[PDB]
Amino acid sequence: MNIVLMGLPGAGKGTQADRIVEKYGTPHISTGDMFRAAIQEGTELGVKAKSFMDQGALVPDEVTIGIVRERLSKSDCDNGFLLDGFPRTVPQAEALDQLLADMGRKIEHVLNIQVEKEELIARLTGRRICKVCGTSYHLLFNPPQVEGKCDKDGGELYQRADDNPDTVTNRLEVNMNQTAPLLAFYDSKEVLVNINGQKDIKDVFKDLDVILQGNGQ
Ligand SMILES: Nc1ncnc2c1ncn2[C@@H]1O[C@H](COP(=O)(O)OP(=O)(O)OP(=O)(O)OP(=O)(O)OP(=O)(O)OC[C@H]2O[C@@H](n3cnc4c(N)ncnc43)[C@H](O)[C@@H]2O)[C@@H](O)[C@H]1O
Numbered sequence: 001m002n003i004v005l006m007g008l009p010g011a012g013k014g015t016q017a018d019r020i021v022e023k024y025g026t027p028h029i030s031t032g033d034m035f036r037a038a039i040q041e042g043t044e045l046g047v048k049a050k051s052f053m054d055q056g057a058l059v060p061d062e063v064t065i066g067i068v069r070e071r072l073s074k075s076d077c078d079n080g081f082l083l084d085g086f087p088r089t090v091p092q093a094e095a096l097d098q099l100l101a102d103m104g105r106k107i108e109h110v111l112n113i114q115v116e117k118e119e120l121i122a123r124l125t126g127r128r129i130c131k132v133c134g135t136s137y138h139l140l141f142n143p144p145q146v147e148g149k150c151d152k153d154g155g156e157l158y159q160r161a162d163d164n165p166d167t168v169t170n171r172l173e174v175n176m177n178q179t180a181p182l183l184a185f186y187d188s189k190e191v192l193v194n195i196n197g198q199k200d201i202k203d204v205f206k207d208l209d210v211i212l213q214g215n216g217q
Pocket residue numbers: 007008009010011012013014015016031032033035052053054056057058059060061064085086087088092123124126127128136137138139141142171197198199200201204
């Protein structure tokens with residue numbers, strides 16, 4: 001289906017994304033991941049993006065919408081898709097509506113994973129990423145089976161440069177600044193669903209599953 005996983009930095013979007021892909025096998029589209037790739041590719045876009053990313057600020061809308069416009073217009077998204085960490089602003093939200101309006105489609109579910117700020121901060125403090133697949137772990141709450149090695153590919157784990165305290169507080173503030181309105185936009189569009197993310201990973205997924213697995217509740 002056409003899904004959108006939103007939530008503040010550290011809400012467990014990627015974490016829950018890996019589980020949603022397994023089951024339904026829908027294309028995981030993460031703007032955070034795409035920018036990170038452009039950067040690793042060394043593109044001009046990646047150079048300009050990193051500047052904002054390092055600071056913890058949003059990458060300008062026009063650039064962000066642009067890359068999402070291109071990625072979603074690809075064939076591996078006709079049967080469905082899982083946007084992750086997008087949109088984050090109202091312009092992004094509308095640009096996404098029109099984009100799909102042309103393809104004769106629409107967003108069908110906006111899953112908003114909610115967690116209090118303090119938990120969000122603890123989650124980003126001791127987090128680690130797999131050098132090989134991008135997946136994350138948490139030294140305390142969700143450690144890898146074997147220290148420093150990804151459970152999927154044995155890849156090395158590392159801390160995101162921006163997962164430091166200063167940047168984290170700026171990241172949380174900037175993104176929240178856009179939330180309330182973005183949440184209303186979707187709620188008045190009858191597609192939003194809040195979900196308690198302040199629980200075990202498995203349990204947060206079941207709450208997500210209920211909506212994806214259609215069947216009433
Ligand atoms: N649309 C857009 N517009 C403008 N700019 C944009 C943009 N999109 C991206 N950008 C730019 O790119 C930058 C980086 O983007 P991005 O990579 O998307 O950064 P982010 O916003 O900080 O979000 P995260 O992916 O890091 O968090 P997440 O919720 O997936 O967390 P995770 O699952 O690891 O979970 C966190 C930790 O918690 C643990 N965890 C997960 N679930 C649980 C649970 N249930 N209980 C306890 N711990 C848990 C995990 O193990 C992990 O260690 C942005 O700051 C911005 O500059």
